[PDB]
Design a protein around this ligand. Structure first.
Ligand code: CU
Ligand code: CU
Ligand code: CU
Ligand code: CU
Lengths: 121, 121, 121, 121
């Protein structure tokens, strides 16, 4: 799925995920969020299963974005964890964890959880 | 916290996380899990906030492991999302999402969620 | 939203959630899952915000199902946490945690996480 | 575990959970949080597996709190999902989802996720 994954993907929020999949399992690219304390592109990296099961199963993958770039710093990181499902309407179906840096006293409220679905259109 | 983060960390399961923090926000290294469908080391990559708040707050970070290496392939990926808290007993406090590749019919049961706390000892 | 919430709801898996909302914040009813180790109806209970904000915001709510009834026992419980959004196409948008009873050694893999969207049709 | 569960439990934040376990799987009680937009006690309800496995496994359970009482309304609900582990130092080990009522535009940031461990002392 190196070919399948590589490219430009869009989620339900209107965010844009630009990724390259390496033959060795790497994911590199940029993320631009349509929401939150974010502007322009941010580095991302991740990993995917470069030899998935041949049985109909999706391809596991994940990636991280730390919310610092030359424009802003939102003192946070999101990780998406999910699977790529190939075919006529290819999708990446993810769940994510967004942890902000907090004091000890606020750690209980440090982590948001949600779900993003990415499509090629 | 490039110095703070860089090195060998151990969680409550007895897993070993070996990371280098780059000046530019990169995280690279290897993960070896004490549990699950896993043996030996697996590549990991991630990101962290290289200019955290100076107010007492932790440092946001995350990383991914796809569960494929030369020994096995568990057709899955974990993402940890959390924060580094520096000082006498430094910690990385994380929550994680483990997504397995599944068919459409099994997607509902694709994703495990838990929490790992990493220490230097 | 006592009137709004009360009734029969269906999710994207084809599961059926039958609830009564009490004036005092109670949720009582039955759940029947279309997937998993489940058959027929199972008791559920929960709570919702009986005096929500008047600003356009959704109405917070949650409920639990333990997966035991007269037919089976799957030694697990799901909690859904989410919000009711009223209007022409009313929805309940949830995220859920399914914890199985496990030994200590398997606790790391005890908890599934997903997301369900319920509609009146 | 009706006897095991029933009573007063305390988490790592200093919150107090007072529960009765019914023979039929019910959980009823009150929760008082040490943190957040909360004061005094709030109703809770939930469910647990009243006939757990005899193999060493924990007992699955969950409960909800909507954050409305006579003192305040934080327009939110938490669900804890977890397991009771009996014996010399009994514990309830949970993960939780806290959903706030939000507008559509803020739904992405509606849900916090964390983990609480409850003890009898
Ligand atoms: Cu295989
Ligand atoms: Cu700052
Ligand atoms: Cu209000
Ligand atoms: Cu059994």
């Amino acid at each position: 799925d190196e070919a399948g994954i590589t490219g430009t993907w869009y989620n339900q929020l209107g965010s844009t995920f630009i990724v390259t999949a390496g033959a060795d399992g790497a994911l590199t690219g940029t993320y631009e969020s349509a929401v939150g304390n974010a502007e322009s592109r941010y580095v991302l990296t991740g990993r995917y299963d470069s030899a998935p099961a041949t049985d109909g199963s999706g391809t596991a993958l994940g990636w991280t974005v730390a919310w610092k770039n030359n424009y802003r710093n939102a003192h946070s990181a999101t990780t998406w964890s999910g699977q790529y499902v190939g075919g006529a309407e290819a999708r990446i179906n993810t769940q994510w964890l967004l942890t902000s840096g907090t004091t000890e006293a606020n750690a209980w409220k440090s982590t948001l959880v949600g779900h993003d679905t990415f499509t090629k259109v």
